[PDB]
Amino acid sequence: FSSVEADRTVSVAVAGDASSALAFDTSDSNGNQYSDASSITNGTLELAFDSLGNSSGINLGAKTTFSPLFRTINNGSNNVNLSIYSSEGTIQTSPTILDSYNAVIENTINDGNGNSLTIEYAFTDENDNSIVGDGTNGSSVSLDATGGSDPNEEVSLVIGVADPGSSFDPSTTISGYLSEVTIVASSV
Amino acid sequence: FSSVEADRTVSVAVAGDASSALAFDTSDSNGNQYSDASSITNGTLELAFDSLGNSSGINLGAKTTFSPLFRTINNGSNNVNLSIYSSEGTIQTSPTILDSYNAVIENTINDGNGNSLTIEYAFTDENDNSIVGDGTNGSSVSLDATGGSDPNEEVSLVIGVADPGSSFDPSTTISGYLSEVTIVASSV
Amino acid sequence: FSSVEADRTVSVAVAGDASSALAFDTSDSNGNQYSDASSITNGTLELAFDSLGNSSGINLGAKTTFSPLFRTINNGSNNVNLSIYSSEGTIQTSPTILDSYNAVIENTINDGNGNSLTIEYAFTDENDNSIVGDGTNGSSVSLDATGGSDPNEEVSLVIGVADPGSSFDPSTTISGYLSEVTIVASSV
Fold first, then answer.
1. What is C119-187 written as a DSSP string?
2. Do C59 and A1 touch (CB under 8 A)?
3. Which of A5, A8, A9, A38 is nearest to A24 (CA)?
4. Which of C34, C38, C64 to mutate to test the interface with A (most CBs of A within 10 A)?
5. Beta strands in chain B (DSSP E)
6. Which residues in chain C have Cβ-Cβ distances shorter than 8 Å to A4?
7. Cβ-Cβ contacts under 8 Å, C63 against chain A
8. Cα–Cα distance between A40 and A28 in angstroms, integer?
9. Chain A contact set for B56 (CB, 8 A)
């Protein structure tokens, strides 16, 4: 009624690695690292497939499948549909190289004195389901809310690369690959 | 006219939670309540993003949108422009992390052996419009007077936090965050 | 001179609302009532914040400021200084909650199984001066009588209440608040 009101107060906190509302751990107690393909976050989760040592990244002209990779944690106030839609790349359905799974993240680049090289990505999760984000249909998996009993996420990955016998070479420049694989855990 | 007149009497009452000239409540229905992000006021309403059960706060380098959050109730005999702005932070326009909305409440913090980390807050109301208080222009929404027919108000929220490149770490100290989120429901 | 005289007769007329030497009014033609915070005098003028409707009083921890409230009307001869010294309450300077203002009327109350809650008042009118009573210095404003030009008076009000996070609870009894806000219009 014609007045101001200043009774509010707030407390906030930030946790980058293992205590956010939606976190990622990538390790097992008294066990092993799930895989060093992805490393413990430095304050931001990172994927390092493009370089391993004793191998200059992915092997061309074949299918490279990666182990469970990083797990996920949810503690928000609602059940969530975790999904990955990879803003930088492009959503593709009915894959051209990884023709088994339903939908994928597509990327393509060229040499510079050579032309298209085609690559494809898919995150397979629990029953090999391709978790490929939210789109016209996208793809997602169910999760438990704050507490609950059972989160069920160990998001595996598959990398597919074409095999051009010409119009491409594995030497010299290759333009930038994908980055910024966004994650969504919206409500349902 | 050269005389005193003790002609007056007055009655005053105080109520902090659900019955006042301007009230904030969570009284949806026989079915549900509006999320755990802001518990019922203890005498003064409080925002509790500091912790969500297992989680110690918010994700870095990501956008954390939140549910409708607390509602607002007006009971004064005037259509009032409800608005929100923190006296501890500062008003910013054309957000650096939340670049969709028009304006935000900007806050920043640092590690102590690591320098700035940036963060922004936006309250979106019943239609995703950013309420950011009263300023040179600010932002506000309409309301109904005493009784009226439709207070038709609920204040949504979004939290955006920048990503730390190599100049900040969650480890060790993080200086104080925002507090005292004031509110204005002045006369239009 | 050893005798008595009885040449006496002079009438007395009483009117509780408008025709008195000092009076109060609340509305004007073809327009609006100033506000229902103080309804028209029933023979005595009352302040009714306790029952604003759809509310149980004033918000805690807020600078509850109200509309211009009642005006003041004079029909006497001499210019007067108008002030409110609130016999029941206490006079305080350098307010503790409404700190910007000069002087205030102070009151405090408790729970019975809980302790002090602090509240404060002040009127503004022209100059926004407290107009709080006559005391060691008090606070007053000038007013004209028998027309001439006009009284040019309208006494607004502000209500401040503290924000105790403990030692108090809205629940259960809150002992009596202020009453008898006395008014003085004295000679100068």
1. EEEEE-TGGG-----SSSS---EEE--S-TT-------EEEEE---SSS--SSS----------EEEEE
2. no
3. A38
4. C64
5. 3-5, 8-11, 22-23, 46-48, 62-66, 73-74, 80-86, 90-93, 103-109, 117-125, 156-161, 181-187
6. 62-63, 65
7. 3-6
8. 12
9. 13, 15, 19-20
CB contact B171 to A (< 8 Å): no
Q: What angle do CA C177, C179, C182 make, to 5 degrees?
A: 145
Residue linked to tokens 């008042």:
C121
First-last CA distance in chain B: 38
Asked if C44 is an interface residue toward chain B (Cβ–Cβ < 8 A), one would say yes
- Structural domain harbouring C59: 1-188
- Please give the single-letter amino acid code of residue A105: I
User: Which stretches within chain C are classed as H helix?
Assistant: none
Give the CA angle between residues B131, B135, B141 to the nearest 5°.
30
Residue C107 in tokens:
């009151």
What's the token pair of residue C76?
């006497």
Record the tokens describing residue A11, joined without a space: 């407390």
The verdict on residue A15 lying in a domain is no
B1 vs chain A: nearest CA distance in angstroms? 33
Q: B88 and chain A: CB distance < 8 Å anywhere?
A: no
DSSP state of B126: T
Experimental technique, in short, is cryo-EM
Q: Token digits for C184?
A: 């003085």
Q: Which residues pair with C159 in a beta bridge?
A: C64, C121
Length of chain C: 188
Q: Which of C36, C55, C165 sits opposite B43 (nearest CB)?
A: C165
Q: For chain C, how many structural domains are there in total?
A: 1
Q: CA geometry: angle at C59 spanning C57 and C62, to 5°?
A: 145
CB contact C40 to A (< 8 Å): no
Contacts of A74 (CB under 8 A, 6+ apart): A21, A22, A80, A82, A143, A144, A145, A151, A153, A185
A11 found inside a domain: no
Q: Residue C169 is encoded by which pair of tokens?
A: 């609870």
Helix, coil or strand: residue B84: strand
Helix (H, G, I), strand (E, B) or coil at C42: coil
Give yes or no for C46 touching B (CB within 8 A): yes
Sign of the CA dihedral running C74, C78, C81, C84: negative
Going by the DSSP 8-state scheme, the letter that residue C50 receives in this structure is G
Alpha-carbon span B48 to A10, nearest angstrom? 6
Write out chain C residues lying below 8 Å of B187, CB-based. 67
- Cα of B73 to nearest chain C Cα, Å: 10
Output the CA torsion B129→B133→B138→B139 (10° steps).
30
- What's the CA gap between A52 and C17, in Å, rounded? 92
Look at residues C132, C159, C125, C157 and name the one whose alpha carbon lies nearest to residue C57: C159
Residue A131 belongs to some domain of the structure: yes
Tell me how close the Cα of C94 comes to any Cα of chain B, in angstroms: 22
